[PDB]
JSON list of C-alpha atoms and ligand atoms in Angstrom, two decimals:
[
{"chain": "F", "resi": 17, "resn": "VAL", "atom": "CA", "xyz": [-36.02, 40.28, 19.78]},
{"chain": "F", "resi": 18, "resn": "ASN", "atom": "CA", "xyz": [-37.70, 38.74, 22.84]},
{"chain": "F", "resi": 19, "resn": "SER", "atom": "CA", "xyz": [-40.92, 36.83, 23.57]},
{"chain": "F", "resi": 20, "resn": "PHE", "atom": "CA", "xyz": [-42.86, 39.62, 25.32]},
{"chain": "F", "resi": 21, "resn": "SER", "atom": "CA", "xyz": [-46.16, 40.05, 23.46]},
{"chain": "F", "resi": 22, "resn": "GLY", "atom": "CA", "xyz": [-48.99, 42.57, 23.38]},
{"chain": "F", "resi": 23, "resn": "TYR", "atom": "CA", "xyz": [-47.19, 45.48, 25.08]},
{"chain": "F", "resi": 24, "resn": "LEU", "atom": "CA", "xyz": [-47.68, 49.13, 24.29]},
{"chain": "F", "resi": 25, "resn": "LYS", "atom": "CA", "xyz": [-44.36, 50.92, 23.70]},
{"chain": "F", "resi": 26, "resn": "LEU", "atom": "CA", "xyz": [-44.08, 54.01, 25.91]},
{"chain": "F", "resi": 27, "resn": "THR", "atom": "CA", "xyz": [-40.45, 54.91, 25.17]},
{"chain": "F", "resi": 28, "resn": "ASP", "atom": "CA", "xyz": [-37.29, 53.52, 23.61]},
{"chain": "F", "resi": 29, "resn": "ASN", "atom": "CA", "xyz": [-36.96, 51.06, 26.51]},
{"chain": "F", "resi": 30, "resn": "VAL", "atom": "CA", "xyz": [-40.25, 50.95, 28.50]},
{"chain": "F", "resi": 31, "resn": "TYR", "atom": "CA", "xyz": [-43.27, 48.81, 27.54]},
{"chain": "F", "resi": 32, "resn": "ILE", "atom": "CA", "xyz": [-46.60, 48.42, 29.38]},
{"chain": "F", "resi": 33, "resn": "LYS", "atom": "CA", "xyz": [-49.52, 45.97, 29.37]},
{"chain": "F", "resi": 34, "resn": "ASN", "atom": "CA", "xyz": [-52.64, 45.15, 31.39]},
{"chain": "F", "resi": 35, "resn": "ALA", "atom": "CA", "xyz": [-51.64, 41.77, 32.79]},
{"chain": "F", "resi": 36, "resn": "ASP", "atom": "CA", "xyz": [-51.34, 39.62, 35.89]},
{"chain": "F", "resi": 37, "resn": "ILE", "atom": "CA", "xyz": [-47.58, 39.46, 36.48]},
{"chain": "F", "resi": 38, "resn": "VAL", "atom": "CA", "xyz": [-47.92, 35.88, 37.76]},
{"chain": "F", "resi": 39, "resn": "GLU", "atom": "CA", "xyz": [-49.59, 34.71, 34.56]},
{"chain": "F", "resi": 40, "resn": "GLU", "atom": "CA", "xyz": [-47.14, 36.71, 32.43]},
{"chain": "F", "resi": 41, "resn": "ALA", "atom": "CA", "xyz": [-44.13, 35.21, 34.20]},
{"chain": "F", "resi": 42, "resn": "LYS", "atom": "CA", "xyz": [-45.35, 31.64, 33.73]},
{"chain": "F", "resi": 43, "resn": "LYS", "atom": "CA", "xyz": [-45.77, 32.29, 29.99]},
{"chain": "F", "resi": 44, "resn": "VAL", "atom": "CA", "xyz": [-42.53, 34.13, 29.19]},
{"chain": "F", "resi": 45, "resn": "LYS", "atom": "CA", "xyz": [-40.18, 32.60, 31.80]},
{"chain": "F", "resi": 46, "resn": "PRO", "atom": "CA", "xyz": [-38.15, 35.83, 31.70]},
{"chain": "F", "resi": 47, "resn": "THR", "atom": "CA", "xyz": [-34.57, 36.02, 32.84]},
{"chain": "F", "resi": 48, "resn": "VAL", "atom": "CA", "xyz": [-35.66, 38.44, 35.59]},
{"chain": "F", "resi": 49, "resn": "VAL", "atom": "CA", "xyz": [-39.04, 39.00, 37.26]},
{"chain": "F", "resi": 50, "resn": "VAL", "atom": "CA", "xyz": [-39.17, 41.90, 39.73]},
{"chain": "F", "resi": 51, "resn": "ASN", "atom": "CA", "xyz": [-40.93, 41.45, 43.05]},
{"chain": "F", "resi": 52, "resn": "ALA", "atom": "CA", "xyz": [-42.50, 44.36, 44.92]},
{"chain": "F", "resi": 53, "resn": "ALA", "atom": "CA", "xyz": [-40.74, 43.37, 48.14]},
{"chain": "F", "resi": 54, "resn": "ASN", "atom": "CA", "xyz": [-40.51, 44.75, 51.67]},
{"chain": "F", "resi": 55, "resn": "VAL", "atom": "CA", "xyz": [-37.28, 44.92, 53.67]},
{"chain": "F", "resi": 56, "resn": "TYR", "atom": "CA", "xyz": [-38.11, 41.69, 55.55]},
{"chain": "F", "resi": 57, "resn": "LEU", "atom": "CA", "xyz": [-38.94, 39.76, 52.36]},
{"chain": "F", "resi": 58, "resn": "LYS", "atom": "CA", "xyz": [-42.28, 38.85, 53.95]},
{"chain": "F", "resi": 59, "resn": "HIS", "atom": "CA", "xyz": [-44.35, 38.10, 50.86]},
{"chain": "F", "resi": 60, "resn": "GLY", "atom": "CA", "xyz": [-47.85, 38.54, 52.23]},
{"chain": "F", "resi": 61, "resn": "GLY", "atom": "CA", "xyz": [-49.92, 40.52, 49.76]},
{"chain": "F", "resi": 62, "resn": "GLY", "atom": "CA", "xyz": [-49.99, 42.44, 46.53]},
{"chain": "F", "resi": 63, "resn": "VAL", "atom": "CA", "xyz": [-47.51, 41.33, 43.89]},
{"chain": "F", "resi": 64, "resn": "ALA", "atom": "CA", "xyz": [-45.26, 39.64, 46.46]},
{"chain": "F", "resi": 65, "resn": "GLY", "atom": "CA", "xyz": [-48.01, 37.49, 47.94]},
{"chain": "F", "resi": 66, "resn": "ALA", "atom": "CA", "xyz": [-49.13, 36.47, 44.45]},
{"chain": "F", "resi": 67, "resn": "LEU", "atom": "CA", "xyz": [-45.65, 35.57, 43.20]},
{"chain": "F", "resi": 68, "resn": "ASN", "atom": "CA", "xyz": [-44.88, 33.62, 46.36]},
{"chain": "F", "resi": 69, "resn": "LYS", "atom": "CA", "xyz": [-48.17, 31.70, 46.17]},
{"chain": "F", "resi": 70, "resn": "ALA", "atom": "CA", "xyz": [-47.34, 30.75, 42.57]},
{"chain": "F", "resi": 71, "resn": "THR", "atom": "CA", "xyz": [-44.03, 29.23, 43.82]},
{"chain": "F", "resi": 72, "resn": "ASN", "atom": "CA", "xyz": [-45.87, 27.10, 46.38]},
{"chain": "F", "resi": 73, "resn": "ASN", "atom": "CA", "xyz": [-44.15, 29.14, 49.17]},
{"chain": "F", "resi": 74, "resn": "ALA", "atom": "CA", "xyz": [-40.63, 28.25, 47.92]},
{"chain": "F", "resi": 75, "resn": "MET", "atom": "CA", "xyz": [-39.92, 31.96, 47.45]},
{"chain": "F", "resi": 76, "resn": "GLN", "atom": "CA", "xyz": [-40.74, 32.59, 51.12]},
{"chain": "F", "resi": 77, "resn": "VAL", "atom": "CA", "xyz": [-38.57, 29.68, 52.34]},
{"chain": "F", "resi": 78, "resn": "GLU", "atom": "CA", "xyz": [-35.60, 30.95, 50.31]},
{"chain": "F", "resi": 79, "resn": "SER", "atom": "CA", "xyz": [-36.25, 34.51, 51.49]},
{"chain": "F", "resi": 80, "resn": "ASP", "atom": "CA", "xyz": [-36.32, 33.52, 55.17]},
{"chain": "F", "resi": 81, "resn": "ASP", "atom": "CA", "xyz": [-32.88, 31.95, 54.80]},
{"chain": "F", "resi": 82, "resn": "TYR", "atom": "CA", "xyz": [-31.63, 35.09, 53.01]},
{"chain": "F", "resi": 83, "resn": "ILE", "atom": "CA", "xyz": [-32.81, 37.33, 55.86]},
{"chain": "F", "resi": 84, "resn": "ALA", "atom": "CA", "xyz": [-31.44, 35.02, 58.56]},
{"chain": "F", "resi": 85, "resn": "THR", "atom": "CA", "xyz": [-28.00, 35.29, 56.92]},
{"chain": "F", "resi": 86, "resn": "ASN", "atom": "CA", "xyz": [-27.95, 38.91, 55.71]},
{"chain": "F", "resi": 87, "resn": "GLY", "atom": "CA", "xyz": [-30.53, 40.89, 57.66]},
{"chain": "F", "resi": 88, "resn": "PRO", "atom": "CA", "xyz": [-33.15, 43.17, 56.13]},
{"chain": "F", "resi": 89, "resn": "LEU", "atom": "CA", "xyz": [-32.82, 45.05, 52.89]},
{"chain": "F", "resi": 90, "resn": "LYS", "atom": "CA", "xyz": [-32.80, 48.85, 52.72]},
{"chain": "F", "resi": 91, "resn": "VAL", "atom": "CA", "xyz": [-35.79, 50.80, 51.43]},
{"chain": "F", "resi": 92, "resn": "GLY", "atom": "CA", "xyz": [-34.68, 51.56, 47.88]},
{"chain": "F", "resi": 93, "resn": "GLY", "atom": "CA", "xyz": [-32.52, 48.42, 47.81]},
{"chain": "F", "resi": 94, "resn": "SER", "atom": "CA", "xyz": [-32.73, 44.98, 46.27]},
{"chain": "F", "resi": 95, "resn": "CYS", "atom": "CA", "xyz": [-31.40, 41.45, 46.18]},
{"chain": "F", "resi": 96, "resn": "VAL", "atom": "CA", "xyz": [-31.28, 38.76, 43.49]},
{"chain": "F", "resi": 97, "resn": "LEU", "atom": "CA", "xyz": [-32.76, 35.38, 44.43]},
{"chain": "F", "resi": 98, "resn": "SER", "atom": "CA", "xyz": [-34.14, 32.44, 42.49]},
{"chain": "F", "resi": 99, "resn": "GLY", "atom": "CA", "xyz": [-37.07, 32.88, 40.14]},
{"chain": "F", "resi": 100, "resn": "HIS", "atom": "CA", "xyz": [-38.25, 29.36, 41.00]},
{"chain": "F", "resi": 101, "resn": "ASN", "atom": "CA", "xyz": [-40.83, 28.15, 38.45]},
{"chain": "F", "resi": 102, "resn": "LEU", "atom": "CA", "xyz": [-41.55, 31.70, 37.24]},
{"chain": "F", "resi": 103, "resn": "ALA", "atom": "CA", "xyz": [-38.25, 33.07, 35.91]},
{"chain": "F", "resi": 104, "resn": "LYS", "atom": "CA", "xyz": [-34.53, 32.42, 36.07]},
{"chain": "F", "resi": 105, "resn": "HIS", "atom": "CA", "xyz": [-34.07, 35.08, 38.76]},
{"chain": "F", "resi": 106, "resn": "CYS", "atom": "CA", "xyz": [-36.28, 37.23, 40.96]},
{"chain": "F", "resi": 107, "resn": "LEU", "atom": "CA", "xyz": [-35.04, 40.75, 41.68]},
{"chain": "F", "resi": 108, "resn": "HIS", "atom": "CA", "xyz": [-36.66, 41.67, 45.00]},
{"chain": "F", "resi": 109, "resn": "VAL", "atom": "CA", "xyz": [-36.88, 45.49, 45.00]},
{"chain": "F", "resi": 110, "resn": "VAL", "atom": "CA", "xyz": [-38.09, 47.57, 47.96]},
{"chain": "F", "resi": 111, "resn": "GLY", "atom": "CA", "xyz": [-39.94, 50.70, 46.96]},
{"chain": "F", "resi": 112, "resn": "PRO", "atom": "CA", "xyz": [-41.00, 53.07, 49.73]},
{"chain": "F", "resi": 113, "resn": "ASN", "atom": "CA", "xyz": [-44.34, 52.22, 51.34]},
{"chain": "F", "resi": 114, "resn": "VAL", "atom": "CA", "xyz": [-46.25, 55.48, 51.75]},
{"chain": "F", "resi": 115, "resn": "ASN", "atom": "CA", "xyz": [-48.58, 53.73, 54.22]},
{"chain": "F", "resi": 116, "resn": "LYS", "atom": "CA", "xyz": [-45.48, 53.31, 56.43]},
{"chain": "F", "resi": 117, "resn": "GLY", "atom": "CA", "xyz": [-44.45, 56.97, 56.08]},
{"chain": "F", "resi": 118, "resn": "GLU", "atom": "CA", "xyz": [-41.41, 56.24, 53.91]},
{"chain": "F", "resi": 119, "resn": "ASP", "atom": "CA", "xyz": [-39.75, 58.84, 51.69]},
{"chain": "F", "resi": 120, "resn": "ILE", "atom": "CA", "xyz": [-41.18, 58.80, 48.16]},
{"chain": "F", "resi": 121, "resn": "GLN", "atom": "CA", "xyz": [-37.83, 60.22, 46.99]},
{"chain": "F", "resi": 122, "resn": "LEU", "atom": "CA", "xyz": [-36.56, 56.67, 47.57]},
{"chain": "F", "resi": 123, "resn": "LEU", "atom": "CA", "xyz": [-38.62, 55.50, 44.57]},
{"chain": "F", "resi": 124, "resn": "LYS", "atom": "CA", "xyz": [-35.92, 56.63, 42.14]},
{"chain": "F", "resi": 125, "resn": "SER", "atom": "CA", "xyz": [-33.28, 54.68, 44.07]},
{"chain": "F", "resi": 126, "resn": "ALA", "atom": "CA", "xyz": [-35.54, 51.62, 43.93]},
{"chain": "F", "resi": 127, "resn": "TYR", "atom": "CA", "xyz": [-35.88, 51.83, 40.14]},
{"chain": "F", "resi": 128, "resn": "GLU", "atom": "CA", "xyz": [-32.09, 52.25, 39.74]},
{"chain": "F", "resi": 129, "resn": "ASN", "atom": "CA", "xyz": [-31.75, 48.58, 40.70]},
{"chain": "F", "resi": 130, "resn": "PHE", "atom": "CA", "xyz": [-33.38, 47.69, 37.36]},
{"chain": "F", "resi": 131, "resn": "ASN", "atom": "CA", "xyz": [-30.37, 49.11, 35.47]},
{"chain": "F", "resi": 132, "resn": "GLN", "atom": "CA", "xyz": [-28.26, 46.14, 36.59]},
{"chain": "F", "resi": 133, "resn": "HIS", "atom": "CA", "xyz": [-30.33, 43.84, 34.32]},
{"chain": "F", "resi": 134, "resn": "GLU", "atom": "CA", "xyz": [-30.65, 44.10, 30.55]},
{"chain": "F", "resi": 135, "resn": "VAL", "atom": "CA", "xyz": [-34.32, 42.98, 30.40]},
{"chain": "F", "resi": 136, "resn": "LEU", "atom": "CA", "xyz": [-36.94, 42.68, 33.16]},
{"chain": "F", "resi": 137, "resn": "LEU", "atom": "CA", "xyz": [-40.62, 41.92, 33.73]},
{"chain": "F", "resi": 138, "resn": "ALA", "atom": "CA", "xyz": [-41.83, 44.16, 36.53]},
{"chain": "F", "resi": 139, "resn": "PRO", "atom": "CA", "xyz": [-44.71, 45.86, 38.36]},
{"chain": "F", "resi": 140, "resn": "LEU", "atom": "CA", "xyz": [-44.92, 49.57, 39.10]},
{"chain": "F", "resi": 141, "resn": "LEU", "atom": "CA", "xyz": [-42.92, 50.08, 42.29]},
{"chain": "F", "resi": 142, "resn": "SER", "atom": "CA", "xyz": [-44.66, 51.54, 45.34]},
{"chain": "F", "resi": 143, "resn": "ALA", "atom": "CA", "xyz": [-48.07, 51.29, 43.59]},
{"chain": "F", "resi": 144, "resn": "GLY", "atom": "CA", "xyz": [-51.00, 49.21, 44.82]},
{"chain": "F", "resi": 145, "resn": "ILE", "atom": "CA", "xyz": [-50.88, 48.51, 48.54]},
{"chain": "F", "resi": 146, "resn": "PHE", "atom": "CA", "xyz": [-47.61, 50.46, 48.87]},
{"chain": "F", "resi": 147, "resn": "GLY", "atom": "CA", "xyz": [-49.80, 53.56, 48.60]},
{"chain": "F", "resi": 148, "resn": "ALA", "atom": "CA", "xyz": [-48.06, 55.75, 46.00]},
{"chain": "F", "resi": 149, "resn": "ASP", "atom": "CA", "xyz": [-49.65, 57.35, 42.94]},
{"chain": "F", "resi": 150, "resn": "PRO", "atom": "CA", "xyz": [-49.10, 54.86, 40.07]},
{"chain": "F", "resi": 151, "resn": "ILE", "atom": "CA", "xyz": [-48.95, 57.70, 37.52]},
{"chain": "F", "resi": 152, "resn": "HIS", "atom": "CA", "xyz": [-45.97, 59.04, 39.47]},
{"chain": "F", "resi": 153, "resn": "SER", "atom": "CA", "xyz": [-44.40, 55.57, 39.67]},
{"chain": "F", "resi": 154, "resn": "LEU", "atom": "CA", "xyz": [-44.61, 55.19, 35.89]},
{"chain": "F", "resi": 155, "resn": "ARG", "atom": "CA", "xyz": [-42.97, 58.60, 35.38]},
{"chain": "F", "resi": 156, "resn": "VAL", "atom": "CA", "xyz": [-40.04, 57.80, 37.71]},
{"chain": "F", "resi": 157, "resn": "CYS", "atom": "CA", "xyz": [-39.65, 54.45, 35.95]},
{"chain": "F", "resi": 158, "resn": "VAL", "atom": "CA", "xyz": [-39.38, 56.02, 32.49]},
{"chain": "F", "resi": 159, "resn": "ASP", "atom": "CA", "xyz": [-37.00, 58.72, 33.76]},
{"chain": "F", "resi": 160, "resn": "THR", "atom": "CA", "xyz": [-34.74, 56.29, 35.69]},
{"chain": "F", "resi": 161, "resn": "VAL", "atom": "CA", "xyz": [-34.63, 52.87, 34.02]},
{"chain": "F", "resi": 162, "resn": "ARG", "atom": "CA", "xyz": [-32.42, 52.68, 30.94]},
{"chain": "F", "resi": 163, "resn": "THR", "atom": "CA", "xyz": [-32.58, 48.91, 30.42]},
{"chain": "F", "resi": 164, "resn": "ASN", "atom": "CA", "xyz": [-35.55, 47.18, 28.76]},
{"chain": "F", "resi": 165, "resn": "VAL", "atom": "CA", "xyz": [-38.50, 46.94, 31.14]},
{"chain": "F", "resi": 166, "resn": "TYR", "atom": "CA", "xyz": [-41.85, 45.24, 30.48]},
{"chain": "F", "resi": 167, "resn": "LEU", "atom": "CA", "xyz": [-44.37, 46.59, 32.99]},
{"chain": "F", "resi": 168, "resn": "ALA", "atom": "CA", "xyz": [-47.42, 44.53, 33.98]},
{"chain": "F", "resi": 169, "resn": "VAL", "atom": "CA", "xyz": [-50.19, 46.08, 35.41]},
{"chain": "F", "resi": 170, "resn": "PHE", "atom": "CA", "xyz": [-52.90, 43.76, 36.76]},
{"chain": "F", "resi": 171, "resn": "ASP", "atom": "CA", "xyz": [-55.68, 46.28, 37.48]},
{"chain": "F", "resi": 172, "resn": "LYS", "atom": "CA", "xyz": [-57.56, 47.10, 34.28]},
{"chain": "F", "resi": 173, "resn": "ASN", "atom": "CA", "xyz": [-58.89, 50.49, 35.38]},
{"chain": "F", "resi": 174, "resn": "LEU", "atom": "CA", "xyz": [-55.39, 51.52, 36.48]},
{"chain": "F", "resi": 175, "resn": "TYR", "atom": "CA", "xyz": [-53.84, 50.49, 33.04]},
{"chain": "F", "resi": 176, "resn": "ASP", "atom": "CA", "xyz": [-56.19, 52.56, 30.89]},
{"chain": "F", "resi": 177, "resn": "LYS", "atom": "CA", "xyz": [-55.60, 55.64, 33.05]},
{"chain": "F", "resi": 178, "resn": "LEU", "atom": "CA", "xyz": [-51.81, 55.18, 32.94]},
{"chain": "F", "resi": 179, "resn": "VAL", "atom": "CA", "xyz": [-51.78, 54.97, 29.14]},
{"chain": "F", "resi": 180, "resn": "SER", "atom": "CA", "xyz": [-54.21, 57.85, 28.59]},
{"chain": "F", "resi": 181, "resn": "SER", "atom": "CA", "xyz": [-52.30, 60.15, 30.96]},
{"chain": "F", "resi": 182, "resn": "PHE", "atom": "CA", "xyz": [-48.77, 59.29, 29.81]},
{"chain": "F", "resi": 183, "resn": "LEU", "atom": "CA", "xyz": [-46.69, 62.22, 28.62]},
{"chain": "J", "resi": 17, "resn": "LIG", "atom": "C1", "xyz": [-47.53, 47.33, 42.79]},
{"chain": "J", "resi": 17, "resn": "LIG", "atom": "C2", "xyz": [-48.50, 46.66, 43.71]},
{"chain": "J", "resi": 17, "resn": "LIG", "atom": "C3", "xyz": [-48.03, 46.05, 44.89]},
{"chain": "J", "resi": 17, "resn": "LIG", "atom": "C4", "xyz": [-48.89, 45.41, 45.78]},
{"chain": "J", "resi": 17, "resn": "LIG", "atom": "C5", "xyz": [-50.25, 45.37, 45.50]},
{"chain": "J", "resi": 17, "resn": "LIG", "atom": "C6", "xyz": [-50.74, 45.96, 44.33]},
{"chain": "J", "resi": 17, "resn": "LIG", "atom": "C7", "xyz": [-49.89, 46.62, 43.41]},
{"chain": "J", "resi": 17, "resn": "LIG", "atom": "C8", "xyz": [-50.47, 47.27, 42.14]},
{"chain": "J", "resi": 17, "resn": "LIG", "atom": "C9", "xyz": [-50.24, 46.40, 40.84]},
{"chain": "J", "resi": 17, "resn": "LIG", "atom": "C10", "xyz": [-51.01, 47.01, 39.58]},
{"chain": "J", "resi": 17, "resn": "LIG", "atom": "O1", "xyz": [-52.35, 46.62, 39.59]},
{"chain": "J", "resi": 17, "resn": "LIG", "atom": "N1", "xyz": [-50.58, 44.99, 41.08]},
{"chain": "J", "resi": 17, "resn": "LIG", "atom": "C11", "xyz": [-50.19, 43.91, 40.33]},
{"chain": "J", "resi": 17, "resn": "LIG", "atom": "N2", "xyz": [-49.46, 44.15, 39.18]},
{"chain": "J", "resi": 17, "resn": "LIG", "atom": "C12", "xyz": [-49.08, 43.09, 38.42]},
{"chain": "J", "resi": 17, "resn": "LIG", "atom": "N3", "xyz": [-49.32, 41.79, 38.63]},
{"chain": "J", "resi": 17, "resn": "LIG", "atom": "C13", "xyz": [-50.03, 41.62, 39.79]},
{"chain": "J", "resi": 17, "resn": "LIG", "atom": "N4", "xyz": [-50.38, 40.33, 40.19]},
{"chain": "J", "resi": 17, "resn": "LIG", "atom": "C14", "xyz": [-51.10, 40.47, 41.41]},
{"chain": "J", "resi": 17, "resn": "LIG", "atom": "C15", "xyz": [-51.21, 41.81, 41.72]},
{"chain": "J", "resi": 17, "resn": "LIG", "atom": "C16", "xyz": [-50.51, 42.57, 40.70]}
]
């Protein structure tokens, strides 16, 4: 039993809700919140910009030190950093950005990072400003993640379509 509330159950391990991931994180304080990161950990817009803003830019300061030490992530890769005031940890995961020409096949690799954590709050990877079809992102999620994932989806019109079209 966990404190996630109001989710629809898609599968044995995947749950989905129309919600602002920032507001959800502040309520649940999950062990792991997933960020929709880029390889530079430059948290400008979308989920990343919103999470970082909610940390008063502390996420960005920490991320800049991470990059200065380790260099960029890989597309499909991830790193674990602090969750600041939002969660214990933030798993920064880089899905492919279709608007940068990156290989959508990398989306499965991106979701595989979730399997290293027993429970996560997360957005749909590569959706939104990363340019991929969110229906496809949900499918890859369900077919790749085996741990317990609570998906937030901020956009209301997007949520209803994802539920109604789910196979
Ligand atoms: C995946 C992605 C990345 C970048 C931009 C937009 C999206 C699409 C999703 C679904 O709507 N966005 C969000 N999902 C949950 N919590 C959110 N909080 C603020 C935005 C937001």
